[PDB]
Amino acid sequence: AAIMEIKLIKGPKGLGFSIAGGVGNQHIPGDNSIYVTKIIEGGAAHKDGKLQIGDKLLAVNSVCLEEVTHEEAVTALKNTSDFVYLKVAKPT
């Protein structure tokens, strides 16, 4: 849909959301993409307040999140440091 780029400061606890999706772990039938399922209270994503449950993750910094496995996505999002560009697209 509309490409949103959200800029986040990584909190001590991490980014403050949870994801599902990936190759071999579809969150929706026929769709491999990475989705945000939860935004925890008091976290970085919550307090910035642009990210939303249901949002498809497209990229984190210099790493692409289209058609990757759940594990490639998890290491990509956890191997960040302090400052993060998050590319997402909002649901239709």
Binding site: G14, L15, S18, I19, G22, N25, Q26, H70, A73, K78
Partner: peptide
């Protein structure tokens, strides 16, 4: 069954 990960 699907995997959800904290981040």
């Amino acid at each position: 069954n699907e995997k959800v990960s904290c981040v």
